[PDB]
Design an enzyme around this catalytic site. Structure first.
Site, PDB file in Angstrom:
ATOM      1  N   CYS D  61       0.795  -1.218   0.000  1.00 17.09           N
ATOM      2  CA  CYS D  61       0.000   0.000   0.000  1.00 17.09           C
ATOM      3  C   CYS D  61       0.826   1.265   0.000  1.00 17.09           C
ATOM      4  O   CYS D  61       2.054   1.267   0.117  1.00 17.09           O
ATOM      5  CB  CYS D  61      -0.916  -0.003   1.239  1.00 17.09           C
ATOM      6  SG  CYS D  61       0.080   0.181   2.761  1.00 17.09           S
ATOM      7  N   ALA D  64       3.258   1.704   2.879  1.00 15.25           N
ATOM      8  CA  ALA D  64       4.508   1.003   2.602  1.00 15.25           C
ATOM      9  C   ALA D  64       5.422   1.851   1.722  1.00 15.25           C
ATOM     10  O   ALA D  64       6.613   1.982   2.016  1.00 15.25           O
ATOM     11  CB  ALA D  64       4.295  -0.362   1.949  1.00 15.25           C
ATOM     12  N   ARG D  95      12.739  -4.002   6.290  1.00 15.22           N
ATOM     13  CA  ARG D  95      13.559  -3.592   5.127  1.00 15.22           C
ATOM     14  C   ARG D  95      14.951  -3.189   5.629  1.00 15.22           C
ATOM     15  O   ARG D  95      15.129  -2.391   6.555  1.00 15.22           O
ATOM     16  CB  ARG D  95      12.821  -2.461   4.413  1.00 15.22           C
ATOM     17  CG  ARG D  95      13.671  -1.966   3.180  1.00 15.22           C
ATOM     18  CD  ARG D  95      12.769  -1.066   2.389  1.00 15.22           C
ATOM     19  NE  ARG D  95      13.141  -0.404   1.133  1.00 15.22           N
ATOM     20  CZ  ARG D  95      13.394   0.906   1.071  1.00 15.22           C
ATOM     21  NH1 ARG D  95      13.515   1.664   2.145  1.00 15.22           N
ATOM     22  NH2 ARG D  95      13.528   1.409  -0.178  1.00 15.22           N
ATOM     23  N   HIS D 194       5.277   6.588  -2.924  1.00 13.06           N
ATOM     24  CA  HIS D 194       6.478   7.294  -3.390  1.00 13.06           C
ATOM     25  C   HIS D 194       6.126   8.739  -3.822  1.00 13.06           C
ATOM     26  O   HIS D 194       6.764   9.707  -3.439  1.00 13.06           O
ATOM     27  CB  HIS D 194       7.072   6.645  -4.620  1.00 13.06           C
ATOM     28  CG  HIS D 194       7.477   5.199  -4.482  1.00 13.06           C
ATOM     29  ND1 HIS D 194       7.626   4.418  -5.603  1.00 13.06           N
ATOM     30  CD2 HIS D 194       7.759   4.415  -3.394  1.00 13.06           C
ATOM     31  CE1 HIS D 194       7.988   3.196  -5.213  1.00 13.06           C
ATOM     32  NE2 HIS D 194       8.080   3.170  -3.898  1.00 13.06           N
TER      33      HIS D 194
HETATM   34  S1  CFM Z   1       9.769  -3.590  -3.948  1.00 17.18           S
HETATM   35 FE1  CFM Z   1      12.554  -1.126  -6.138  1.00 17.18          FE
HETATM   36  S2  CFM Z   1      11.038   0.449  -6.810  1.00 17.18           S
HETATM   37 FE2  CFM Z   1      11.047   0.436  -4.575  1.00 17.18          FE
HETATM   38  S3  CFM Z   1      11.267  -1.884  -1.073  1.00 17.18           S
HETATM   39 FE3  CFM Z   1      11.881  -3.195  -4.659  1.00 17.18          FE
HETATM   40  S4  CFM Z   1      12.333  -3.222  -6.867  1.00 17.18           S
HETATM   41 FE4  CFM Z   1      10.431  -1.593  -3.095  1.00 17.18          FE
HETATM   42  S5  CFM Z   1      14.592  -0.110  -6.010  1.00 17.18           S
HETATM   43 FE5  CFM Z   1      13.644   0.022  -3.996  1.00 17.18          FE
HETATM   44  S6  CFM Z   1      14.749  -0.772  -2.214  1.00 17.18           S
HETATM   45 FE6  CFM Z   1      12.956  -2.038  -2.534  1.00 17.18          FE
HETATM   46  S7  CFM Z   1      13.271  -4.138  -3.209  1.00 17.18           S
HETATM   47 FE7  CFM Z   1      12.970   1.497  -6.065  1.00 17.18          FE
HETATM   48  S8  CFM Z   1      12.521   2.009  -3.946  1.00 17.18           S
HETATM   49  S9  CFM Z   1       9.198   0.169  -3.398  1.00 17.18           S
HETATM   50 MO1  CFM Z   1      11.175  -3.991  -2.165  1.00 17.18          MO
END
Ligand code: CFM
Ligand code: CFM
Ligand code: CLF
Ligand SMILES: [Cl-]
Ligand SMILES: [Cl-]
Ligand SMILES: [Mg+2]
Ligand SMILES: [Mg+2]
Ligand SMILES: [Mg+2]
Lengths: 478, 519, 519, 478
Positions: D61, D64, D95, D194
């Protein structure tokens, strides 16, 4: 005797009924009931005799008495368990004879050195292996002050001569290399190992500094026969130093070859374990004119008596110091008794240990209002049973070298509230529902000597006697 | 000093100022080496130069990793019903055997001696044997008195068999009591040899005159050898019940080493019955689960009982448990139970879930030969590197077999196998080869302590798997065989890695960027 | 940089010189507080002054020790056969519930959302329910779709019962699929409340119109409440089989949380069947094993099913297990099995063997209300002192019961109980009350770290018992109830004491006078 | 298309045959097969749509996206999860956005601060409780540089006004107090969080130091969009500093409020994650005239391309430094390829992650000889699909917002040798016998960015693809 005595003599006859006739007759002379007017046991009990074959005696061997008890604690020497691999492995770090040092470097008590005899050593002899072993030991352990060779059963049986090896290696190393003929078949128990070890100390250690300068003090003493179990000797030494004495040597808990060599320069030998080291105390009195006296550092009644008697061997300054030390700890003592005596008074204890503690800890128990109803020793001699008589209530069961069968039968009949004994007895009596404290290893606690030790002792007897789990042996639906 | 409100035991009592002062004062009466020299020799004991000198030893043993024969005869004897172990010879040995097992199992251990002394050195010990059997029978009422020997009895050449025949002839031991015996010299082999020698004595006593017929009973016998985990005896019986294949363990001390604390002492409990041992020759086969030490037991099975003695590996790990179940299924003709296939898949799930923390980890390990072979095999199966492998009591034929196994694995390329070497040798190897962890028994605690004193970066943590385990409680209840035992080994290994990593990353403001909540 | 033969992960890569220099350079661009001011504030956070300010909080919560209702409803739902958990509301919730259970169990977790977005506060979520039930049914083919709610849904006031009936009447979900529901507001209670609410929903769906008769089946039902150790579901079934008393667990997720890795993904496995739940009112009784949380479940048993709901304490410890088996015996009329009495005696033997290390030891502990009362009870029974006891989600009736139990015991005289307090409160208590150890979940690792940073003398080591357990593997397989679970707790506690004492006594030449081989 | 493209189109029709008709129609527009001739996806795929109800989407969501991804990593601010207790507990330390500092004192990323809404807060509103909470926060956590308020679902639904509270509390404390309306019912996925968070940073943070002096260099840059997973941004920053650049700010892994406020003074914004932070990079180009460029630090091909293009924005001195840094690490790179490429080449991979990594890590897999047979995103937009097309081989399956059904069916049909995805996917695919690496958390390893990260990435793919356990899923009797 009194009603308690009569009940105990009837228990003795019942317990021995199971024994075949030859054993039965022999075993009857190893038990009695005490009489407060008696000052000597006389022909009323016999001890320090062979064990009966096949009965599950608690005893060990002469190697236990020499390696395990007397020499094993000396931290600055490497002690070789010479023979096959078993003896040194089972006795590796089993006894809590505490020391400080850097293991494997300047202090060696938790390493197990052995010549690991194989069949070719039995057929051809082990002296060549022993000599080579000592070379290798000096290469890898250069900071040893000296080396001992503790013989196991095979060595004398095959005709080896470790004394010739010890002499040759001592010349080559330029350090004492001490041969001990403590094979486990000699004697009847751990006791002969003590005596063998005292005689070896007499001839191979104690004359090494004769005619050398040594800076003395009027109040130089040695602690003779305290193996620092759980730090017991440190908790005793602090009191002797607080009273104004200099403890030049401690035999052998946290002890060194150097301290032992300086012992003929002291003014007074203080013997705690009479059984194991009376021999060398009497030797130093004869040869070096050093007086010696027995003392007891278990609980405040005995500690005060001992501090006053030790001090009376000196002058008015140490006599005054003895009173000041006792007064300094009086508050601590009265708080311990006031907290724990009420939780323990009137409870009855059975004791079964080696050669000293079965009589030596009775005053501490009495200081917490506990009563001793039976006391026995694995390997004590008649002069120890003599020394036990003043501290027993009339009619108490006093016994020697009990089998597992006898101790179990005594416990089932007497129904002690608490048992103090060893590791081979612990888990039997806990399953029978009797609170048990190990009174050799202190059940991984201690120290129990001295004023600091009495607090730990009281905490531990309360902890175990009053633990809540003792009310749960029987399921609630039964 | 002490306070009533907080009494301190030995540690940390002796940390207090007055005791540190006492120690400084006592030091001055010892003619101690100065601290700089002791430091210098300690450092030198951690070096490759010292290691080379250490490995030149031919006479001195330091910190052995084995015990003597009669300990293993005592443990085999305790696994038979109503049996009293009895060691002919000197009594100091029996005080030590009982104590050694008391401290591992936290249980009572029954065993007698006949107390031979210097008198018995010239006359022989036949009087001790007669009186000893007589007194032990009267006091302890065993159905079986299982006799082994101490080294004094072996050196003097006591004719065990004859002594027992004389005790029987002369009425010292009744005809209702069985008295199996074995010679167990401490200067040959080790405690595992004593166990096998005792087992052969039981086999002769209970089956030599029997005319057996393999497969007359549709069952398998199982022989464990020297084994000190209660869970291993129990898991074998549990899996066989799931298979629906009748079985008997021949020597099973798991009930007498785990009696309840209910107000009664039971010197005897459970064990292989006389009926099970006497009818053993009629089973389909007998599976020898620690094959390197069960050498005379294999000659019993093949030459006395005319059974296959189907070769099996120690059932440690996933593949060796699969091979044991396939062997039981082939011999019995019964399929592997669906509950065992389910358990196997749960172990594989655990291996996949934890593999990123175990792959590539380097281990040192030591112990008895069969255990060390089995644990090395399972570490290779996990993708771990068993870089330092030591068995003090293993022989050259076992060493060749271990090197054959290691050479055939991608994970064995850097592995070195040491036989007839001890824990002072192992200590140098931890300093020079520096594996991540070492798997051993309680004697390994001193090696962990010594590696830590060189520095935190050099510490090799101990993982306790073996015997004896004296400084933790109730580990002897665990299981190390079967899928259940493999689950305990995988869990133990991955959480040792994770405990060490948390400790390394637990310095606030310094290494705790990687003190992750989830691992 | 990295070397090819030894590649370092994050820790300890960043310990290398080039990264330490990188960190100094970055620090210059952060306007960092000075190192002395940071140390001053850290020291202040360990004081009694800070503690008093911390306990004045009314609005801020820091490091809570509880989760929200739907997590508990999802776990309840997973324990029924062929059931797909479904949370009506917004999707971020379901990603987090699945993830939270994935990291504890190391297993997949099936759960769907109907992805309610912005428009649902004006229109309501009926379209989402219709389409969600239709799509979940087609893709996942459940027999039971177990509906709970997210906070969005609750605030909006969606009428679940009416949506579900509208879905069936309009053909979005087949009439043969069972669709129990429960309202699970995250702003009331905690995850244990959601579990109990979900159980009430299953009971209404499967038993509302049933004419039951207690004792028509000679069985007992058991209800565990929110429980995350697989061994507790399993030990209850095993003990009932030994008692020879038929039983059903109502909600048992122990097979769907432990499927094998055998090449197949099974989204459904085991679980309470529809037949077990529909016949539940005919059992003799239903035993609610976590009584403080099973509040509506007790109303089911008594008011719907007209069963006694015989009061039972959580079966943690020796005495509480004894009481469970005496209650099972009294309700069934069958005797307690001899195998269970043997197991009990072995536990008592372990407690007597290990008592000198546990007696007088001081513990802090936190977790859910039922667990904390049970573990506090057993710690008193061991002679330990539970000095700091916290349960963030417990209420005043539970706190009164806890103080009553503590006041009655010799070992509760210094015990303090805290409700509606979190782990930032617990952190202060570890600094001011300094128990020997703390029993908690993985979030406790941060408190352990914090106390060590004041000094090695102040460290309070964590013992992991509870949920979630994210930083060690496979602890979720363990058992904490019954005599089997008590064996685990006893062994865990005594070996934590011994591991810490070894660490404290492992400094070569300094504290190793007490580094004993035998303990 | 080619034979692979044909099979994938046939697989698409088969997989969607399970969906009810309303969803089925919709889902066919979320998957396609790639064409190397194509520059933009055009009408071939649609993305950033609502998920279908009840299908088990992998998506999270907007909270998150805002709290979990953009704001949570900022170490010198306290982030409040404002609403009921669930959201902040499940996202507490999940995370691995690494940072250095002293937890609870000057850095707050692993603490979970919440207003723990209860029913009275739903009924009367939470703004009074939030104002009180912020006073208590400042009393107990005095070294915060600023505070953020991350709204959970209920806050906007009950009509609260957290901007009024943020304004009043920021005046009361004299610190930035930033309101974020990132309720999880907003948007369709993490993505809107974002965007919401970038707009908040634009208004509440970036202008805070406008007009103030700041000492600049010609080589000042910011790392935009690297959350330092396992120390990925440290492993990236070291190369940029080795190349002669000064990294003034890192957004937001190991990031600070201070660095963000100084970002409008840099010369060049370096965008790694385009999806999550392109919004603020575009804003800084328009408002502050700061150029920005996308780069990729996964694997040696992309790293060298990136270092050279970044250095080309400056001068010949930085251009020569780019060549020197590449040369400095070329032996390390050749050793990693020589050890690991032979162990991995030819093997096929399926990727499924959020918004960037599904295309961004393809170079690094190709440097180790692996091939990507299918790649998908949870919540990416069509400009991310556009950006993926240059790195796909013809006829690769490219898909969006897959249900668990669809991922499972793709895996079963395609049979990849290795899967890279998240924690909700890991334990399903391991049970199906497919080697799996978590490509969000790095399966508790990393870093993967940079030259030091490529070593770790290669080690990790070999460890898991070639582990011996993958040959043991079927019992040997089956
Ligand atoms: S699933 Fe990145 S757009 Fe965002 S937490 Fe992962 S593929 Fe996120 S690279 Fe990043 S650090 Fe991520 S890996 Fe962009 S931040 S919402 Mo889950
Ligand atoms: S059983 Fe002491 S004469 Fe000797 S080891 Fe214990 S009661 Fe010995 S006091 Fe001592 S430290 Fe002892 S406790 Fe004399 S030394 S052969 Mo077992
Ligand atoms: S009385 Fe030794 S334990 Fe024995 S069988 Fe020989 S190796 Fe083994 Fe005393 S000296 Fe020792 S302990 Fe006995 S043997 Fe003798
Ligand atoms: Cl061998
Ligand atoms: Cl409650
Ligand atoms: Mg026991
Ligand atoms: Mg799993
Ligand atoms: Mg900092």
């Amino acid at each position: 005797t009194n009603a308690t005595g009569e009940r105990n003599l009837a228990l003795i006859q019942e317990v021995l009924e199971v024994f075949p006739e030859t054993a039965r007759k022999e075993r009857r002379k190893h038990m009695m009931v005490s009489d407060p007017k008696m000052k000597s046991v006389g022909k009323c009990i016999i001890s320090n005799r062979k064990s009966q074959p096949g009965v599950m005696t608690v005893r060990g061997c002469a190697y236990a008495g020499s390696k395990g008890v007397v020499f094993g604690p000396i931290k600055d020497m490497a002690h070789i368990s010479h023979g096959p691999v078993g003896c040194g492995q089972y006795s590796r770090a089993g006894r809590r004879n505490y020391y400080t040092g850097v293991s494997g470097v300047d202090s060696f008590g938790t390493l197990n050195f052995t010549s690991d005899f194989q069949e070719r050593d039995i057929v051809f002899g082990g002296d060549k292996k022993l000599s080579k072993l000592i070379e290798e030991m000096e290469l890898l352990f250069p900071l040893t002050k000296g080396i001992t060779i503790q013989s196991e059963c095979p060595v004398g049986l095959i005709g080896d001569d470790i004394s010739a090896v010890a002499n040759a290696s001592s010349k080559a190393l330029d350090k004492p290399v001490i041969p001990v003929r403590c094979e486990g078949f000699r004697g009847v128990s751990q006791s002969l190992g003590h005596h063998i070890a005292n005689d070896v100390v007499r001839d191979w250690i104690l004359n090494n500094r004769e005619g050398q300068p040594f800076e003395t003090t009027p109040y130089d003493v040695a602690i003779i026969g305290d193996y620092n179990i759980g730090g017991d000797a440190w908790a005793s030494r602090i009191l002797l130093e607080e009273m104004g004495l200099r403890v030049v040597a401690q035999w052998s808990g946290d002890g060194t070859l150097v301290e032992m060599e300086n012992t003929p320069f002291v003014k007074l030998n203080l013997v705690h374990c009479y059984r194991s080291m009376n021999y060398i105390a009497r030797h130093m009195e004869e040869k070096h004119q050093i007086p010696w006296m027995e003392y007891n550092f278990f609980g405040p009644t005995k500690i005060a008596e001992s501090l006053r008697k030790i001090a009376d061997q000196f002058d008015d300054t140490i006599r005054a110091n003895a009173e000041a030390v006792i007064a300094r700890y009086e508050g601590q003592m009265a708080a311990i008794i006031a907290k724990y005596r009420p939780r323990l008074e009137g409870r009855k204890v059975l004791l079964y240990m080696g050669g000293l503690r079965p009589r030596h800890v009775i005053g501490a128990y009495e200081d917490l209002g506990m009563e001793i109803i039976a006391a026995g020793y694995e390997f004590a001699h008649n002069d120890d049973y003599d020394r036990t008589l003043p501290d027993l209530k009339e009619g108490t069961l006093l016994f020697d070298d009990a089998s597992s069968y006898e101790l179990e039968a005594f416990v089932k009949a007497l129904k002690p509230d608490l048992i103090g004994s060893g590791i081979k007895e612990k888990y039997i009596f806990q399953k029978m529902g009797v609170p048990f404290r190990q009174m050799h290893s202190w059940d991984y606690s201690g120290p129990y000597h001295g004023y600091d030790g009495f607090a730990i002792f009281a905490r531990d007897m309360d902890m175990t006697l009053n633990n809540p789990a003792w009310n749960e042996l029987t399921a609630p639906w039964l | 000093s002490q306070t009533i409100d907080k009494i301190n035991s030995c540690y940390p009592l002796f940390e207090q100022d007055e005791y540190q002062e006492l120690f400084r004062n006592k030091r001055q009466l010892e003619e101690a080496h100065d601290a700089q020299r002791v430091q210098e020799v300690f450092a030198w004991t951690t070096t490759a130069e010292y290691e080379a000198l250490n490995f030149r030893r031919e006479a001195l043993t330091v910190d052995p990793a084995k015990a003597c024969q009669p300990l293993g005869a005592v443990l085999c004897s305790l696994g038979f019903a109503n049996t009293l172990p009895y060691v002919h010879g000197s009594q100091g040995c029996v005080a030590y055997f009982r104590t050694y097992f008391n401290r591992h199992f936290k249980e009572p251990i029954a065993c007698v001696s006949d107390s031979m002394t210097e008198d018995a050195a010239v006359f022989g010990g036949n009087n001790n044997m007669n009186l000893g059997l007589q007194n032990a029978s009267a006091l302890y009422k065993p159905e079986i008195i299982a006799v082994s020997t101490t080294c004094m009895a072996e050196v003097i050449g006591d004719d065990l068999q004859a002594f027992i025949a004389n005790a029987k002839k002369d009425g010292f031991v009744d005809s209702s009591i069985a008295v199996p015996h074995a010679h167990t010299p401490s200067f040959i082999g080790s405690h595992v040899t004593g166990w096998d020698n005792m087992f052969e004595g039981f086999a002769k006593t209970f089956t030599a005159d029997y005319q057996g017929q393999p497969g007359k009973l549709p069952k398998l016998n199982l022989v464990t050898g020297f084994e000190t985990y209660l869970g291993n005896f129990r898991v074998l019986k549990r899996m066989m019940e799931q298979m629906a294949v009748p079985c008997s363990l021949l020597s099973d001390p798991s009930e007498v080493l785990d009696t309840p604390a209910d107000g009664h002492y039971r010197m005897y409990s459970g064990g292989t019955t006389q009926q099970e041992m006497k009818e053993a020759p009629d089973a389909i086969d007998t599976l020898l689960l620690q094959p390197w030490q069960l050498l005379k037991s294999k000659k019993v099975v093949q030459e006395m009982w005319n059974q296959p003695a189907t070769e099996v590996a120690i059932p440690l790990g996933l593949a060796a448990t699969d091979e044991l179940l396939m062997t039981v299924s082939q011999l019995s003709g019964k399929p592997i139970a669906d509950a065992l296939t389910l358990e196997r898949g749960r172990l594989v799930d655990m291996m996949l879930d934890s593999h990123t923390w175990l792959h590539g980890k380097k281990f040192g390990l030591y112990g008895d030969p069969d255990f060390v072979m089995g644990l090395t095999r399972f570490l290779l199966e996990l993708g771990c590197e068993p870089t330092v492998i030591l068995s003090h009591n293993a022989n050259k034929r076992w060493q060749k077999a271990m090197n054959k196994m290691l050479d055939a694995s991608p994970y064995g390329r850097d592995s070195e196998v040491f036989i007839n070497c001890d824990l002072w040798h192992f200590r140098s190897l931890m300093f020079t080869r520096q594996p991540d962890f070492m798997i051993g028994n309680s004697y390994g605690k001193f090696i962990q302590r010594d590696t830590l004193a060189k520095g935190k970066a050099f510490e090799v943590p101990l993982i306790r798997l073996g015997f004896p385990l004296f400084d933790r409680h109730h580990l002897h209840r665990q299981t190390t065989w079967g899928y259940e035992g493999a689950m305990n080994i995988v869990t133990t290994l991955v959480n040792a890695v994770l405990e060490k990593l948390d400790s390394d990353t637990s310095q606030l403001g310094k290494t705790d960027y990687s003190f992750d909540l989830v691992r």
